[PDB]
Structures are given as C-alpha cells and as structure tokens.
Design a protein around this ligand. Structure first.
Ligand code: HEM
Ligand code: HEM
Lengths: 727, 727
C-alpha cells in the first residue's frame, strides 16, 4: 500500500542540483559515479533495499510488520513473538557513547593529492608523487556541545582528516585556530570540565558563557591566546568551507636520509575566510541548529565541493630555539611573517556519506596515527593526546576491533599477530599467533626502515634531563601572542572581540570572576581592557592602567594573516541569495537576476508569504522554496527584492523584518523598481547607502554591484548605523 | 591555593533565593535541611570536597596536578606517569549511551501524599494512608532530540515519576498529552525512526518538521490525534510546571477483595496550564536552549516548588464496552465530560539533584515497575513497553545491576537469589543462591498475596482467542478524537494549530506529502483543512470538500478540559517580569513595582544597556542583572518600563526591539510616565489598548492591572494587531 507518487517526485535526481531543488539523499544514490579507492572498498558492506523482501536479521521473511502476536486481537502479547522482540531489541540498543569532546560533527568523503613530490623533506608515501591520489574522510566539529547540540555556537571548531595512504592511515586531527587553550595534557580534564555544562545542573550546552569557564580562564593565563581567537569572529564561522585548519603542534618530517625538519600543518580554505556576526549566529542556533551540517551536505550535492590547500610551516632543526617563544608550546603560534606557509597539496571533499551513524558517528581519528616520514615532538599537549584517543575508542566503539568498522579500515594491507577481542571480524588462518615463530616461517615479518615501504623507526632525538613533573620555564609567557592577535585585527574585528568578551562575561554570575578576567585583559592591551570594562560597568584601577604591554613577537607589531578580513579573499561560488517574491513578479527582473547569479555560481531561494506557487507577469510559474519566516535572512548571504506588485508584500510584517534583520547583520540588499519603497523600513538613506543596491530595474549593472558587495562578504561600513535599528 | 574571594561571594547562601540572585548549586548545599527518606538514604554515597587533599582514585595524594612526568622539563612524557594515566583514563570513559528516546530531560526530588486512603479500590501501600509520605524522583523530557538538544522545541513531553514505596518502586512513566501516536508497540521503531533525524545526514535534531515524519503520519492515520496535540500550543509548554501529565494507557487497580477497576492516570499542574507561542519557542531554542531545565532548577531554589495533583479516571469492569472507542486503544482519550478525574493526592518537587550525571542521567524508569494493588491491561502499546525498558537499560547502564546505582535503589528491602553481573555491589552472604533450598531454610521466601505486605499476583483476566498478529477492529477509527480535540479549542488555539501544521508542512520538501496530510485533515474538519491548505497554496478538491466529518464521541461535540485556556487557571507566582532601566530611574516607581511583584511571588530582572549599576533619582544604587540582548523578552512573562530619563534608552535599538518582541508574543506590557513614549514603537493609540498598562506613575492600580493581565498569561485579543509588526 502506502506507495510512491505516480510521478516519481519522491526520489532525488542523481545529478548535481542547487540547495533545495531536490530532497537530499545518501551519497552513493546522489552521485553513483563519484568514486575513490576508499569509497569502492566500502561496497562489501553497503546494503540496498529496492525490490527486496522485509526480513528479520536471520533472514526470515516477515508477513505482518504492523502487529504483535497476541492471544486474540484484543489479547495479551505473547513471549513467543520473536519478530517483535528482535525488532525492539535492536531499537533498544541503537545508541553508543558520544565522543567525550567534539561530539557534534559533520563529515564527508574526498581525495587529496600533492602539487609536487616532497621527497627531499619527507619520505611519506602520500606526499611523494603529484599523480598519486589519496582518499580522505573529513569530520568538522564543535568542542563542547553534545551530538544533538547546535552548529553555529561560539566555539573552536575541529577539522579532522583521515588519509588512507598506501603505507598506512595518517590522521591529521586539527582545529580552526593555530593554538590550543592549555600547555600540558594533564590539565585537559580540568579545562574540558570547566567549559562543559556545569556538573550540578548540566547547563549550559554548547556555549562557554558561564562561570566555570571564565573562572578557569582567569586562573590560567595560558588560555588567553585561544580565548582571544574564540571571542573573535573566528569562533562563529559562516561555513566549514570558510574557515582555516591547523594541526597546532610542531611535528617532524623525516626524509630518506634521516634528516628531521620541524613542521606545522595548515589548511587554507579555497572558498576564502568568512564568519557570521554574533547576533546572527546565536539566533541561527534556534532557527536552524543544523545549519553547518546542512550547508556542507548541500554544497557537495550542488558540486560546490569544499576545497582546501594543505600548507606547511617548515623550521630547520638548528633553528629550534631561535624564536622568542618555544616551538613545542601549543599556546604559541608561528607568525607567517616569520615562517611562511609552503603550499603542499589540495584536498577536495566531493561525496557525502550514505549513513551518518555508520560512517560519521563510528569514525575514529587519532593524532598518533602517523606513517613513515612523519614523527612526533615533545610538545606536552601532543604527548598526552597519544594515550587518550586509543583509550577512549575502546569504550566508545565497544572493543579493540574498531579498525574493522568499515569507515576506519585501512585500504592498504594490515597483517599482525593480534587476535580476538569483541566483535572480531577477521578470521586469521595463520597457524602462529606469535613471533618469533618457526611454524609459519615467521610471517608476517618485520621490515627494516628505508626510503620507501620501510618499517617505522622513531627519529633518534637526544633526551637529557631528570624525571620531573615541571612546566618548561620557556612556556611561561602568556600575553604577547594574544596582543599580536589583537593588533592584527581590523577595527571592526576588534569591536567584535570586545563584544564577545562583554557578552560572555555579562553571563558570569559571580562578579569577581568578571573583574579577574578584565585584569588579565589589561596585561594584553589597555584599549581592549577598557572597552570590555566599560560594557561591564567596571573601572580599571590606577595600577591596571599602568601595566606594561607585553613585548612584540620577534619584532612584529602585527601580522595580517591573523585577520579574517584584512586581506580580501572573498569567493561567491556556493553562496546563496534570498529573492523576496510578490504575486506578480516582473519576470524581466527575475531573468536578469538569475542569469547573473548563475554565472558566478551563486544560488537563489525564492521566498513568499505562503507556500505553493506564484505566477510571474509573463505566466512563468514559480515554486516557493520557503516562507519569509520559514527561511529567515540568517540563512542567506544577501537579499534581492524584484519589482512587480510590491503592494502585495509592502505591509507584510515578515517581509519588512526580513530586510531589517539582513540590514542589522551587515548583508548586501538589492532593491529594484517599486521595491525601493522598502528603504523606509530599514530607515536609512534616500540618496542611497554603500551596501544597498538600487535601480529602476534589476540589470547587468545592478547585479554587478550586488555581486561585488557579496565578494566582500559583509558591509562593515554600516556598523555605526545598526545599533539604533529595532531588530 | 586559596583562590576564593575573601568576601565569600563565590558561595550561594543556603536559603531560598529568587532566580538570578545567587549562583545555582548542588541541591544538598543549597537546601541542606530539605530531606526525605530517599534523600537521606543517598548519604552513604555523597562525596564532599572541602578541606580534603586531592588524590588518585586509589587514595594516593597528588603533589603536582598541573604537569605530566617527563624526562627533562621539555622532554617526552613517560609511560610510568600513573597519575596522568588514571586522570585521563577516567576522563576518556565519562560518557554512556543516551536514552534511545527522551534523551533530553530535567529532574528533581520531591514527595507524594494521598489525600485519603484508597483502600476500597486499591491495596497499593503508597495510597493507603494520608499520613504516608512517599519520596519521588521526577524527570521531564522531550522525545526526539539528543541529550544536548534544546528544551523549547515543538514536541510531546515526557513526565516520569519514580515512587519509592514501602512495597517496591512504582514508576509512572507518562507524557503531557493523553494519547500516544501509535497503537501497537511493534511499530515503535518505525514511528521513532520517522520522527528522528533522517539517516543519511542526521537532520533535523529536535523538531518534527521534516519529510519522514509527515510521510509516516500521512500513511498512518492512527497518528493524527497525537499530531493534533503536538501542533497545538500543547507542544510548546511555558514550563514543566505548567503542563498536564497522563499515563495514557488504561491500567487496573486491584483491591484486597480481588476486584479490578480500570484506571487512567492524570497529573494536574497546580501552577495552571500555560504555553509559549511558536515564534517565541523557536527563537528561545537559540537564545537559551536550556530554558526549561533552568526554569525548573531556579523555581526549586526560589521555593516555587512544582506542585501536581494526581488524579484517576475510574471505570468499572462492567463498563469496558460502553464507549464509542476501545479503552485499550492508546490513540483514544477518555473525555472528562464522560468520566471525571477523581483527585487522589499531591506531589511537590522541592530539591534539585547534587550531580546531574549521577542522579538524572543514570535514573532508570520503567512502566513495568508496578506494585501489589496495580496491574496491567492488554493495551498493545503498553504490552510492548514492558519488554523494552528492561532491555534498553542493560546496555545504557552497563549491566543487570542498574538497580544498585544509588538513584534507582529501592528504599524498602530487596532480597533474592540473583547474583553476579557487571558492577555487582551487593555482597551476598546467603549460603544458597537457589530455591527451593534446605541449606538456608529456604530464605528468602515467597509471600502469599494478601491485603497488605503480600506477594504480587496477576489479576486473573480471562484470555480467549487464537494466536494472531492482528489489530482489533475496534481500534480502526482515526478521526473522531482529533475532531473532538479541534472543536474544544478556543479560536486563537485553533489558529495556532493551523499555524503549526502550516509551518511544519512548509519544511516538507516533497510537495505530495503536504497534499496527503491536507487530505487527512479534510477527514477531521473542513475549516482546519482549508486554512492549512490556503497557507500551503493548495486547493481542496470537490471530493475533499464533501468528506463527511467523523461522528461525535459518545454525543460530545466539545470538552473544555481539552483546551489550555478555555477555562482560566492562571497562577502568577513563579513568573518573571523584565524591568527596563534608564540612567535616572524614578525610585518611587521602582519601589512600587518591586514590592507589588514580591507580594505575589512574581520575580523581576533589572535590565540595562550594560552591566554594573545605575543610580536612581534619589541616589539608590540599582544592580543590573543582564543587558537587553543578554536576557531577551523571550525569557520573561511581561515587561515593565518605569519613568526616569527615558531619553537614555529611547533610541536604543535593543530596548525598542525588546518591546516589539514582547508585544508580538502577546505579553503584557506596562509603561509609566515618560515610558509612554515607547507607545510609538509598538504603534499604541493615544487612548491605549487592552493588554497595555499605562499611567502617569506606577502607583495606584497600575500594578494591579498588570498582574491581572499576567494571571491571564497572554493578550489573545492582540493577535490580529501583531499580524503586521516587523519583529
Ligand atoms: C592541539 C590540541 C587538540 C586538538 C587540535 C584536538 C582536536 C580534536 C578533534 C578535531 C577531535 C574530533 C575528531 C573527530 O571528528 O572524531 C578530538 C577528539 C578527541 N580529543 Fe582531541 N584535540 C586536542 C587536544 C586533546 C587532548 C590534550 C586530549 C586528551 C589528552 C584530547 C582528547 C580527545 C578525545 C578523548 C577525543 C574523542 C575521540 C573519539 O572519541 O574518537 N584532545 N580532538
Ligand atoms: C504511552 C506511550 C509511551 C509513553 C507515555 C512513554 C514515555 C516515556 C518517557 C517519559 C520516557 C523517559 C523516561 C526518563 O525520563 O528516563 C521514555 C523512555 C523510553 N521509552 Fe517510552 N513511552 C511510550 C511508549 C514507548 C514504547 C511503545 C516503547 C517501546 C516498545 C518505548 C521505549 C522507550 C525506551 C527504550 C525508553 C528509554 C528508557 C531508558 O533508557 O531508561 N516507549 N518513554
């Protein structure tokens, strides 16, 4: 019974389509021709459904999946109903522990390839040949919230990449800021407990605006640098496609000759850097808590594949101690003005998973999963991470055989003497389960280290010191990097940082904690400190006003690569505009609008006061994607109002509020013909305002203007005009 | 180190205080003198902290909890650091699986007492004497979202109560609507999978506005009754304190003479019935996703204990077949006009937990946990529940000894021959682990059924029929209960139902699903169907326009007890009002305002454009609780603006928007003296309007008028006026 619509509209077309054009679908059904070695290797466990009989897990066909077995139709359920019990038992045991941190995340499949061979600095196989492609699986995430929390919270974001190389799995488990909050892994449980929901009542969920977080920060000044990044607009990215990625720690690259080079890993977003504004981000956690997850999935379904460039900061071994900060301190960044990022390769995410639980939820990343050609360093945060990931996956994934869960399996050979464990899939035929053995002629065998396909050998770093629980004295500087970050931001970025601290500390109930945090800000920069204090009704003391600013970082008074917006990097492909329809749209305006958006790869969403269709002035039937309230301005990058019967929507509260919200949030707005009467609602300018595109009709020049604004992301010059608007 | 402020302001006073006045805290520290038998029995496992040395879990004192052990202060971390490894190991394994459904929930401790002995209808010990107090632990929840999802989503809410009786634990596991979506437990996994996030991409999180839910609903008309309740304002309660509770199924009461009486369980909120409006609820999931958890905790800390009256609908065994519907069908309600609710007792929730994870997350409720004096029925949804909760707790709580986790332990004696299992706490000394035995003289021993303290014996219900997987023909009626619900709602409640369906179906991407749901609505009520269709741009066919409405339910064409608001039951105690300050408030207005609110137990929050303090006209220093943006109008019940230097905030966008938002969401607003200048912000006429209180000062009847409006909850007559308003 209950069947598909006659017309076949239940099923999405298996071709690239813009967001909202078709229902989303499992990756293998949406893009069956998109393949890679890892995607193909998962074919053994993919399960179809069309034309198959419904069965139990033991393969018994079910005749009635609507009713339990009972003694009479109004009688008691019987214990012998094994079909009911198997179905309910499986349902009852669907959940597994969420990740302790980074539980909220969104993932996709893709591939990587180097631009040229890097064999002179590393023997890693995946970086040895420009035409050797390596499948990847990437998961982006937030830190604090649970798996069911919201996407556009203010938080550091995780950026984890699993490379399925020919010499083993390499996991590059990074975040979207170049430093971490703490120096030693021993404090991780303390820091995480402080940022997570407070233990008595389990509030608040995915935001750091609460007493315990700011108490920890105020008592542990090493956290200030990453706190500065979190309070900036870096903490509220527009998309996972428009943020940077960093490995944070200094690692080593080892070449065939045995030479070690220190390296820091970077990902550069080829769509550019872009973030939301706080009010927008917070409201969007309510209007669409799945915004980043959705946006990633739809970009891949549209062909707007997330693309990132891998880059390396390289420091010779002999230059380990030449900076004014320790290279092994994860609260310190290496300014690009001192050590440039060398481009290494490109990563493209081009296919969504088939099943979120099987592939995203069960994926296991670990920074200890390195390969020959790579090695660790003594960074005390990284050292502790090496223990933790393996340990947590034993309980999260139910045993030691988590590498046999399909998404986690290597695509290269794996053979050893490990056996058994819960849910053991591999059936070993080796007569031996130990080495050395004579009974299988000692196979599988050890392999000496070498230039290629060699066994792993650690770099023989010299270790000299007593067994101590002590922080290196070189790590005891906490204010210069925060200050370098502060001075590198534009004026509007600085304002947003001030507003971030002010908002968060206004939610701290104990006033002395707010004062202690302001005291720490006074050791970074007095202008920043005074601006936050003023918003909290706090007065800096005379001593606070006389704190000497921290020294410059190796002579730098600023580094523009630390700003999101100082150096233009805008890219409109993949962005989306809202088009507010009316019941008699001028089709000539629409035609020109859609053509210009199409030429730059910008999507459109047609909105109205109701769902269904509206008919343009030439008879074209226009399906409505959503209502004005249903897809708020928060979800788009710009708003366009075509001419037609403007009287239809001129007095619509939601239509007017749509423009007020977009205006407040600094988005470009374009008004054609009679749509220019909406200028009154955003109560500003009569001769026009930079940021507002207006003309008698939507034409080539009107669209060029709008698209130029869109490439600059937001209208920062409108900032002074928005705090009067009631929106 | 000694980091607390010397003034002791880090610690909350151990006395009842209003929301926001002090930092919240663990229940036993906030209210040490609030006790009950269960709370006292948990003293064996409560752990303090003050004045104790920091140790490992083995009791070894720790000297340096800031650093890992390494070879040299910049060297590698050593494997012999057992302190680091224990600390990180425990952190790595903190999470357990969340509940499969109702994962998001908030709980508190309390007590229950019957008004009079019910010995004539039940032998249940907890209902046998008015002076018998039974400790309870209650958990309120949503259904779909994860543990980290938001509170004010549109969903059915769970209302689960664990009664720690002298004859065993009784768990009454109910919801906030009197029926469930489905009829047979065999479809529970299907219904739940349809409402939960879609499997390819895991979206959307806590809202049912997506294709698979409405696909299922459109193909299974049995769901329409509970869907009607979810689309009404019942799906968005103001607080867990202001919603009703129901057991849903017909159970049995058994008295000492062996007579069975059918019973349906009800909880009546002594604070009244109250819900939010959709736009407010959805925006509140972003501004404060923990609103209901917070509100419950703060109500209890303030002394505004959540109070509920337990009531029974009783039906004699001989009247089983006297209704138009089957008593065993969980998609059908029993109209109070046909069978009144008899008041049974009162439950008061008066203490929060100490540790959310230990007490709330690990609590295990199960409808199969009944006691002598109660029994089950053949309702086919209830029958399947009896299997599922035991099964799911084995994996959720790590084994069969979950009854030994402190919160789940009975307060009465428990002795049997069950042994071992993971995490076994009890050390059995019985020589025997089986019965019958002679080696311990057969103890513990079976106990015959009797009037008091007897063994459990099932009611000897006659069973007759063949073994079949078949729905009773008596359950095959799906539209009369939905229609009865619809006709019992006020006109504004009907509009909100129409708006709920309209918004939800507008998020369904496949248009045919929207059409099929509209067709089902046409079988319930033509006005409802036409209004939803209009909002979707769908036209009803002539056939749909002629579908004959379903019959009345036992001659009823409405039952006012199904409405939230048809019969006023307003209670102002525990509500909160925002007070928008200026930099020279008229102290006289503020004195009058705050004392009037205090006299009725209404809380206040003093808001401004920054934190700190403001000084009134007479020099009174006024502490600011939050900024206008920090504590939006969504979080309060009414807004008051006192006179003073109104020019200070008159052009503040946030202050004006605060009133626009409150106005749109139908909240009472009161403006004193020059604060009447804000009338132009919300377009109020010079002569005024119902729902807006205004006078020259806050004296006289100004506060009485505002409190009268608060008692009516919202200003329903303003609906037509908010239609426009750009907010
Ligand atoms: C530079 C500092 C760090 C970065 C960049 C980082 C990054 C991440 C990321 C991106 C994830 C999520 C991976 C996924 O998507 O599944 C994650 C998970 C995790 N992190 Fe780290 N983290 C850092 C520090 C630490 C430390 C110091 C510890 C403990 C010593 C730690 C313990 C964990 C654990 C236990 C998980 C859960 C993994 C799982 O369940 O599979 N992290 N981290
Ligand atoms: C009248 C219909 C139902 C009502 C009123 C109801 C109510 C609830 C409530 C309030 C909870 C949360 C208890 C807590 O706070 O921990 C819950 C959890 C649960 N429900 Fe039910 N439910 C119903 C139907 C069902 C059915 C038909 C099944 C399966 C056959 C089911 C399976 C579960 C499971 C497995 C849990 C999680 C329990 C745990 O993990 O401890 N429910 N339900």
């Amino acid at each position: 019974d209950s069947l598909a619509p006659e017309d076949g509209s239940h099923r999405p077309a298996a071709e690239p389509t813009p967001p909202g054009a078709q229902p989303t679908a499992p990756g293998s059904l949406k893009a069956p021709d998109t393949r890679n070695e890892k995607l193909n290797s998962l074919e053994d466990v993919r399960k179809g459904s069309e034309n198959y009989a419904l069965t139990t897990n033991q393969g018994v066909r079910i005749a009635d999946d609507q009713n339990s077995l009972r003694a009479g139709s109004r009688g008691p359920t019987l214990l012998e109903d094994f079909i009911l019990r198997e179905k309910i038992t499986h349902f009852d045991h669907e959940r597994i522990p969420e990740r302790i941190v980074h539980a909220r995340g969104s993932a996709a499949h893709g591939y990587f390839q180097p631009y040229k061979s890097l064999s002179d600095i590393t023997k890693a196989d995946f970086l040895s040949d420009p035409n050797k492609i390596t499948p990847v699986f990437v998961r982006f995430s937030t830190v604090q919230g649970g798996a069911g929390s919201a996407d556009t919270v203010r938080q550091i974001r995780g950026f984890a990449t699993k490379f399925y190389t020919e010499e083993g799995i390499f996991d590059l488990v990074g975040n979207n800021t170049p430093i971490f909050f703490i120096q030693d892994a021993h404090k991780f449980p303390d820091f995480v407990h402080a940022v997570k929901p407070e233990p008595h009542w389990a509030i608040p969920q995915g935001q750091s605006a609460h007493d315990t977080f700011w108490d920890y920060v105020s008592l542990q000044p090493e956290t200030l640098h990453n706190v500065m990044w979190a309070m900036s607009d870096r903490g509220i990215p527009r998309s996972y496609r428009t943020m940077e990625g960093f490995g944070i720690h200094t690692f080593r690259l080892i070449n065939a000759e045995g030479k070690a080079t220190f390296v820091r890993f970077h990902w550069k977003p080829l769509a550019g850097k872009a973030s939301l504004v706080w009010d927008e981000a917070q409201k969007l956690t309510g209007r669409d808590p799945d915004f980043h997850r959705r946006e990633l999935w739809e970009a891949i379904e549209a062909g707007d594949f997330p693309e990132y460039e891998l880059g390396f900061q390289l420091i010779p071994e002999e230059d380990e101690f030449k900076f004014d900060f320790d290279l092994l301190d994860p609260t310190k960044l290496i300014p690009e003005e001192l050590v440039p990022v060398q481009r290494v390769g490109k990563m493209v995410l081009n296919r969504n998973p088939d099943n979120f639980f099987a592939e995203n939820e069960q994926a296991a990343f670990h920074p200890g999963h390195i390969v020959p050609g790579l090695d660790f360093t003594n960074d005390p945060l990284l050292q502790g991470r090496l223990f933790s990931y393996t340990d947590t996956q034993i309980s999260r994934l139910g045993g030691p055989n988590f590498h046999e869960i399909p998404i986690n399996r290597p695509t290269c050979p794996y053979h050893n003497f490990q056996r058994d464990g819960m849910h053991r899939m591999g059936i070993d035929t080796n007569p031996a389960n130990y080495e050395p053995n004579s009974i299988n002629d000692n196979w599988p065998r050890e392999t000496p280290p070498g230039p290629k396909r060699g066994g792993f050998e650690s770099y023989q770093e010299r270790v000299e010191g007593n067994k101590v629980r002590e922080r290196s004295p070189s790590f005891g500087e906490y204010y210069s990097h925060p200050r370098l970050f502060w001075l590198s931001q534009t004026p509007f970025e600085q304002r947003h940082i001030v507003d971030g601290f002010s908002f968060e500390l206004s939610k701290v109930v104990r006033p002395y904690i707010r004062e202690r945090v302001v005291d720490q800000l006074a050791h970074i920069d007095l202008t920043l400190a005074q601006a936050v204090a003023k918003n909290l009704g706090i007065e800096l003391t005379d001593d606070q006003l006389n704190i000497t600013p921290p020294p410059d970082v190796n002579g730098l008074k600023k580094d523009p690569s630390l700003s999101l917006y100082a150096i233009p990097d805008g890219d409109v492909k993949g962005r989306v505009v809202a088009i507010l329809l009316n019941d008699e749209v001028r089709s000539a305006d629409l035609l020109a609008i859609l053509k210009a958006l199409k030429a730059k790869g910008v999507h459109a969403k047609l909105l109205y006061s109701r769902m269904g269709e509206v008919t343009a002035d030439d008879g074209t039937v226009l399906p409505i994607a959503a209502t004005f309230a249903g897809a708020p301005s928060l979800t788009v990058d710009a708003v366009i109002v075509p001419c037609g019967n403007i009287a239809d929507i001129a007095d619509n509260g939601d239509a007017n509020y749509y423009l007020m919200e977009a205006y407040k949030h600094l988005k470009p707005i374009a008004l054609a013909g009679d749509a220019r009467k909406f200028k009154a609602t955003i109560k500003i300018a009569d001769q026009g305002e930079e940021g507002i595109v207006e003309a008698d009709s939507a034409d080539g020049s009107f669209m060029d203007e709008l698209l130029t604004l869109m490439a600059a992301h937001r209208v920062w010059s409108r900032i002074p005009k928005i705090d009067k608007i009631p929106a």
